[PDB]
Amino acid sequence: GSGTILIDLSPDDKEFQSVEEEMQSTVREHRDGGHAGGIFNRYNILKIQKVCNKKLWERYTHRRKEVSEENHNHANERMLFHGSPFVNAIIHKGFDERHAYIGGMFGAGIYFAENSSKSNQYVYGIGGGTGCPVHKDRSCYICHRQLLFCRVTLGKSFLQ
Amino acid sequence: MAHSPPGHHSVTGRPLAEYVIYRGEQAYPEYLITYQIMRPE
Ligand SMILES: CCOc1ccc(-c2nnc([C@H]3C[C@H](NC(=O)c4cccc5nccnc45)C3)n2-c2ccccc2F)nc1
Ligand SMILES: [Zn+2]
Known part of the structure; x- marks a missing residue:
């Protein structure tokens, strides 16, 4: 089975507060006026878990x-948000480009954002899909x- | 296609058999063959 352990971080933990602050502080007003991701200026942060695999x-x-050696010994590593309907799969199986949607404006790739509110737009699919499964509300x-x-x-x- | 179909690592067709990989590290260029096509008699 999956070699993924989820480590629950305490709200009082600096690591929790750091990821929490990045999530909250990188919210922006979007051109679609909340159409895809909903209307909000803030989140209710329920859980932050370290994925260990x-x-x-x-x-x-x-x-x-390999990338580092190809780019003058510089990985150009960044911490970035990812939203998609497949988060449960990704934490167990890792990211898989074979499932990438080709209709995306930057082609058959996996999308990340430095704004949490951007990644939030893709949680229920492209353009927010049909919103939440229960209420069908983006x-x-x-x-x-x-x-x-x-x-x-x-x-x-x-x-680009 | 940009990549292998989900669950797959390559594509095989018959439009003779052709094999396609979407990652360069899935092939090693083991032998270099220098040649001419021979004019048939
Ligand atoms: C306007 C711009 O449009 C966009 C915006 C975002 C995306 C986009 N970026 N990444 C994805 C997902 C993640 C990947 N799949 C897996 O990593 C995976 C792993 C393991 C098992 C799986 N099982 C099923 C599916 N995926 C996996 C694709 N997307 C994305 C792709 C399709 C639908 C919604 C998405 F957000 N693409 C285009
Ligand atoms: Zn709902």
Whole structure:
């Protein structure tokens, strides 16, 4: 089975508060006026869990080094938010580009954002899909959402 | 396709057999063959 352990972080833990602050402080007003991700200036942060998986970590650090050696010994590593309907799969199986939606404006890739409110727009699908499963509401205040705050190797990044 | 279908690592077609990989590290260029096509008699 999955070699993923979830480590529950305490609200009083500095690591919790750091990820919490990044989530809250990177909210912005969006051009679609909350159409995709809902209307809000703030989150209710219910849980922050460290995803521990040796297989997925060693896979990441291996590729990070390969990219590093290709880009003047610089990984160009960034902490970035990810939203998609497949967070439960990703924490167990890792990120899989074979499931990437080709219709995206930047092609068949996996999307990250430095704004939490941007990644929130993709939690229920492209353009917020049909919103939450229960109320079919993109701006649902009841249903619990999941984002990933990810270590991402950008290496030599191409501007579009 | 940009990548292998989900659960797959390659594509095989018959439009003769052709094999396609979407990652360069899934092949090693083991032998370099220098040659000419021979004019048939
Ligand atoms: C306007 C811009 O449009 C966009 C915006 C965002 C996206 C986008 N970025 N990443 C994804 C998901 C994550 C990946 N899948 C897995 O990593 C996966 C792993 C393991 C098991 C799985 N099982 C099923 C599916 N995926 C996995 C795709 N997306 C994304 C893709 C489809 C639908 C919604 C999304 F947010 N793409 C385009
Ligand atoms: Zn709901």
